[model samples]
Target: ITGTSTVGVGRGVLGDQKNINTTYSTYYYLQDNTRGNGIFTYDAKYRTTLPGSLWADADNQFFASYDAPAVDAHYYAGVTYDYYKNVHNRLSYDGNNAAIRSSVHYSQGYNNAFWNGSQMVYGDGDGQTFIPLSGGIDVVAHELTHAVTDYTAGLIYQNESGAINEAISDIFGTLVEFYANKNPDWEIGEDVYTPGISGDSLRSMSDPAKYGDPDHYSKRYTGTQDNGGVHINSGIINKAAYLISQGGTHYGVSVVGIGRDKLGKIFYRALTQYLTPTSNFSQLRAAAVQSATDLYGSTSQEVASVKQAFDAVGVK
Candidate 1:
């Protein structure tokens, strides 16, 4: 909607106050014009229809409980856009400036959030399992990173390729969480996974086995479900990523820790330059090694760590 651009105050699903960009055109709309083309958030109205109505508020202040999900979805999109642009120097999910759109309340008791190859979608949850997913910045970034992966690597969503794809999202999701400095952790979806449960997350990059996810390739799930265990097997790669950023000894292999900044740079380079749709786990290791070599030379510790991390995970 075209109107005077303005910034508004809102409280999110987690009861945290933040500023959100809005537009004033008879009603205040969640149309953020500050980043990329724009960030538009919609109301799904507990239905499946995508990109539902643009949220409209009589006043610029969003405080109602019903507004919580929308508030976080809209604001977090901006933060994700900033992370890509400022940190990676990439425009939006695409290399060009693409408009980021999101829809909240996507069905009664819908417990997951996803990127549908076009836009971001979030579920309100049944309250027992999750709250609004966008409340967790990692979850929001994780979904948006899927868009980035789709545009770049275009990795096929099955088997090893799918596991690599899933791990990339988790890696970047954790990076985006740290970039925002909001209760940053190596955990995914901790803030919204289970409101009643404390000190638990959907998965752990540091210790994937904490949730029964495999920490090594030898334990990889060779199953038919979850797109050949895309989500489940991602733990192997996630553990490798964690080792690269925060050095650890896994299965008798030790990585010297190269820090997150370098970890992100290496992975971003690999995702954009080396990976293809059919790329598998072994190919991913090669890409990361080459990416680190390109950034910090073949003999650099960064390159060594990439190799060591893959070895630690039994990716060869």
Candidate 2:
């Protein structure tokens, strides 16, 4: 709907108050027109429907206790958009400034969030495993990064390619978290995962083994479950990404840290330029090496670091 851009304030699931983008015409709507065409958020109302009604508030304010998830989902979507635009110089997720959309409060006790090829869907968790998933910026970015992958590499969601897909999301999600500089750490979903458990995350990039994920490629799960261990084997690539950004040692192998900006540049270039739908672990290593070489130089530390990081994780 056409309207003047507006701002509203609301508390998140963690009770932290923050401002969100909105629009006002007849009534306030959770539509942010400042970025791309717009960033619209909807309320799922604890149902399984896809993209429920656009969130509306009577007073152009959203401070109600029930408005927490919508507020964060809207706000974090904007932040993720800005991250891609400002940092990567990519417009929105498609490089063409597409309007972003998200739905919150999806289904009762739902504990996961995903990008279903079009828009983002969030769940109000059972409160034991998670809270409102949108409350976690990394979670929001992680899901949106899936959309980015779909438009770019179009990585097949199975076997080694699927693990690459998952790792790409985890990589950018953590980068966006650090870009926001809000209690940044190398952990994913630490904020909204297991509220009862502190210092625990859905996955750990610094040390995937902490969560029973393999930090080395040799340990990758070859089973048919989880789309050939898309989520489980992603730890290998996640650890490689972490090492590329922050130097670390594993299995007697060492990598030189190249920092976050270069890390993102290399991966973004690889994702958009070199990777294919069925690219596997060895192919990804080649892509990253080529990406770093293109951005830096074949003899540059960035390129060397990329190679060493993959080797450290036993990628090949």
Candidate 3:
């Protein structure tokens, strides 16, 4: 919908009130023209079809109970966009200021959210499994980072390549969470993962093994499920990323913390400048090492920590 851009106040999936950019046509539509091409949010209307209808409100305010997911989806997408632009100096997912789109309330009990290769989609969840996923900034950022990876490394979504891709999302997802400074931690999807389970998340980057995800390569799942255990094996890289930012000793291997900013720089450099579509864990280690070397020199501690993090994860 084409109209003058305006800001509207709304409460998100978590009942947190915030301002969202909207378009003022006959009705206020969730089409923000302020950033990049735009950030458009749609109502999935509990169906499977994508990019459902442009969310519309009679007034320029969104406060209805049903609007919670949309509010968070729209608002969080903007935050993720700002994170990429402000932190990495990347215009958008493609570094071309592409428009960001998301659809919320995708289906009754849909239970998950994904990039879908084009736009992002969110489910309302079955209540026990999850709540509105957008309530977690890391979730939103994780999905958006898939888009970023698609445009950059185009990492094949299978085997080691897929695990690397998944870890990339988690790594950047956690980084984006800290960037927002909203109850930041190394946990992934803590805010919306389970309604009944307290002190739990879908995954944990700090200690991936706590959630039964392998924190080392020796524990890697060689099964044929989850696209060759893409999600499961990502724990190895996730732990490595955690160790890189917040140092730890794992299985007798120790890494000195280089902080999140440098970790992000090194990973972003690898993702954009060094990684390939079929890159595996070994390749990823080399990419990170070279990336850190380029950013902080081969003799720098940053480069040494990159090596140590991978070593701690048994990446070799």
Considering every candidate listed, which one attains the maximal lDDT? 1
TM-score of each: 0.99, 0.99, 0.99
- Model 2 residue 24 lDDT? 95
Q: Evaluate residue 94 in candidate 3 and report its C-alpha lDDT on the 0 to 100 scale.
A: 92
Q: What digit string (tens of lDDT, one per residue) describes model 3 on residues 154-174?
A: 999999999999999999999
Query: All models: lDDT?
Result: 0.94, 0.93, 0.93
Q: Flag regions of model 1 displaced more than 4 Å.
A: none
Q: Which stretches of candidate 3 lie over 4 Å from their true place?
A: none
Model 3 lDDT at residue 34? 84
**Residue range 32-128, candidate 1, lDDT tens digits:** 9988899999999999998899999999999999999999999988888999899999999998999999999999999999999899999999998
Cα displacement (Å) at residue 53, model 1: 0.1
Q: Evaluate candidate 1 by giving its C-alpha RMSD to the native, one decimal.
A: 0.6
lDDT of 2 by residue, 188-211 (tens): 999899999888999999999999
* Colliding residue pairs in candidate 3: none
